[PDB]
Design a protein around this nucleic acid. Structure first.
Lengths: 61, 261, 177
RNA sequence: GAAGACAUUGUCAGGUGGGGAGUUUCACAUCUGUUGCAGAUGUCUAAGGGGGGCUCAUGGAGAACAGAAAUCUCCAGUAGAACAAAGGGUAAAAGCCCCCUUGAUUUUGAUUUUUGUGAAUACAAACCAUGAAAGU
RNA sequence: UUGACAUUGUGAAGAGACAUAGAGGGUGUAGAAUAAGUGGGAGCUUCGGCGCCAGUGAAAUACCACUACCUUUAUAGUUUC
RNA sequence: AAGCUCGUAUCAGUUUUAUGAGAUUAGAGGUUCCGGGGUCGAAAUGACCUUGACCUAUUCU
């Protein structure tokens, strides 16, 4: 019971992967090594382009 | 823990007293310790507040500041264990700020002394009358961090002081903050620190300048408008006859119409 | 109730058991109740009252007031019956302490703090214009109600609970709860 | 021999337990912290009615101290002023001042926005305010 | 793993607490003195010692009531260890 | 797809006619009485010394 994230957050004071290790800030940094990736549906076509690959021509004024 | 060992506390308060006598710096280890024990709730006693009073009345700056920051921490319950708050404030204002004009404290410490004096005064209905001319040197918008000084000016106002010595203050502020050409923040600060004076001392500015200040209702700047509306709503419930018919808002005017006959 | 009446009756008989200490025994009520903490500012104040305090008041005034209140049997004072007193703190404190209360004209309650400033404001007897039961720091609170009139006791008690054991007493008499 | 009403054994109740199982992946701005912040104080969240009188902004000329701006007088001035910043509407006013009031009141139904309300809208009876009145 | 109950019987000696009945207390400094504090005030008097009027002190002491804390005395019983 | 009130004349991817809708003070100097140095000062709200920020006169709309 003491080894639960609930009890830890209570005794101390969100993102997937916050443990006794690896706070908020650290999880985002470590996810960089993986999820520069390209999302697709089951038939195959772009839902969400990869990071820094948005492919929209902005209004450059 | 179980019971308070008075034989020990009364003994180790005597060493704090006998340290604060040594005028070099050695009362640091009395002040820094008594603050900790007060915060831990171990030394809630009248004998201890005297130690920090003597520290505030000391000559060393880092001891006087320890005492002042203790009595600050909006103040804490230690004020309700003092032996004479009026004489305390009088001795402080006489020794540190005005008396010798030694010019030891910097502005950041003078402001913290002012805060303590005004917050004691407003809370306990004190009368010194030198405060209100000491503020006037520092009540200029060309001065260093005046928003703290003027926020303590109001805190030393009462229902029970001669409003002329506050009229001079209000007419200094009005001459130097809501005059011709002044900026929006400056004028809004002036009006905001005048209305929270008048919330304690209502008959400290007369109708003729009240009207001059409610001029600024529709001021297009959104600081001065929010400020003037506060003064109007303050005198709508207190002395609505000073306001003109245009400002008496549907109930002050009705109360005056029934009570004027 | 008339359980007050049986108390006050043989208090008035105690009136005639240890008769006189060559003065008059005032009547007092001591309030005792719980459930409140005055170290927090839970303050109360009310002055909706009417006695015989062997009336000893000091009115400050002007020419228009001193010859008004030379009748009346009252101690009176000029403005410079006060101006020539500030030089001595214990002198200005002795008059402080002399009188049960203070009053003054509508003109002089702008000038009185420049003269009698530190005193007369913490003492809780500051003057009041002409033409109390403060919960300062304690749970104990006693008030003088009358003299040697059972109505006054209840009259004050309902006001005290209005504001929020009860005891009635005289100068040397016993306590009646 | 040792030990002894404790240990043990039985049932409950807390703790630990990836060793193992299953599973998922509304506002300007003084007063405390993270960085130039989310938070705490206090501080705005707003005078409508119906009668009268009068014209505003700005510019020009002119008057001791008085000047670019202090008060006074005259001329021009369709709004360039104000009415909760480049826009509509308003000039014997929808604006400023003055007089009187507080219809920002109840009852009965009708319409638009909108099936839920609220909002606005007109409509009749009463108590009322206002002006000499029409009328509101 | 730690606690309670049961198994679980026969004896003894001690410590703490409930609960009542009591008993007394207060040095920051000045002040005759060690001032919880508050409110009534100028003697019940064995003494007129004294209380009032006199300093000094935020607060003034006799006399009598209130209701805060602190520390101790005893065990009808109550229990725990 | 199954039908049921009845068989009017109302309708129409159409036409016609009328009619509405910001930065620059170098040049002058005054202050900071919280930034004070300087020979001096038992002692001083000073001779003056600079860092300054301050109130200023300029330019565009």
């Amino acid at each position: 019971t003491g080894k639960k994230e609930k009890s830890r957050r209570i005794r101390e004071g969100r993102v997937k992967g916050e443990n006794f290790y690896r706070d908020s800030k650290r999880v985002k940094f470590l996810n960089m090594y993986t999820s520069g990736k390209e999302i697709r549906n089951k038939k195959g076509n772009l839902i969400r382009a990869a990071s820094f690959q948005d492919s929209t021509i902005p209004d450059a004024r | 823990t179980n019971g308070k060992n008075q034989k020990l506390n009364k003994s180790t308060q005597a060493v704090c007293f006998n340290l604060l006598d040594q005028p070099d710096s050695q009362g640091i280890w009395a002040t820094k310790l008594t603050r900790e024990l007060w915060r831990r709730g171990i030394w809630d006693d009248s004998r201890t507040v005297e130690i920090m009073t003597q520290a505030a009345l000391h000559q060393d700056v880092k001891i006087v500041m320890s005492g002042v920051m203790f009595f600050l921490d909006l103040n804490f319950s230690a004020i309700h264990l003092l032996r004479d708050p009026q004489g305390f404030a009088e001795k402080l204002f006489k020794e540190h700020l005005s008396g010798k004009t030694k010019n030891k404290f910097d502005m950041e410490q003078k402001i913290s002394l002012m805060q303590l004096l005004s917050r004691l005064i407003g809370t306990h209905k004190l009368i010194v009358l030198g405060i209100y001319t000491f503020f006037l040197k520092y009540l200029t918008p060309k001065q260093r961090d005046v928003t703290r000084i003027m926020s303590a000016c109001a805190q030393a106002c009462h229902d029970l002081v001669p409003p002329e010595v506050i009229n001079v203050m209000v007419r200094k502020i009005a001459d130097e903050f809501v005059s011709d050409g002044v900026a929006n923040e400056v004028a809004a600060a002036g009006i905001n620190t005048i209305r929270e004076i008048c919330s304690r001392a209502p008959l400290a500015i007369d109708e003729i300048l009240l009207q001059d200040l409610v001029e600024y209702k529709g001021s297009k700047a959104k600081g001065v408008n929010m400020a003037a509306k506060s003064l109007i709503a303050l005198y709508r419930d207190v002395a609505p006859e000073m306001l003109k018919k245009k400002d008496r808002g549907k109930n002050a005017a009705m109360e005056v119409q029934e009570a004027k006959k | 109730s008339s359980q007050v009446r049986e108390h006050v009756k043989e208090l008035l008989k105690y009136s005639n058991e240890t008769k006189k200490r060559n003065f008059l025994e005032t009547v007092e009520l001591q309030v005792g109740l719980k459930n409140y903490d005055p170290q927090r500012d839970k303050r109360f104040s009310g002055s909706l009252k009417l006695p015989r305090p062997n009336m000893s008041i000091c009115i400050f005034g002007d020419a228009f007031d001193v010859d008004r209140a030379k009748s009346c049997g009252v101690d009176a004072m000029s403005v410079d019956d006060l101006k020539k007193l500030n030089k001595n703190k214990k002198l200005i404190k002795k008059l402080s302490k002399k009188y049960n209360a203070f009053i003054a004209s509508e003109v002089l309650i702008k000038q009185v703090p420049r003269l009698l400033g530190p005193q007369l404001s913490k003492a809780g007897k500051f003057p009041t214009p002409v033409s109390k039961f403060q919960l300062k720091k304690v749970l104990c609170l006693a008030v003088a109600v009358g003299n040697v009139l059972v109505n006054q006791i209840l009259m004050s008690v309902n006001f005290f609970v209005s504001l929020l054991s009860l005891v009635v007493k005289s100068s040397m008499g016993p306590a009646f709860r």
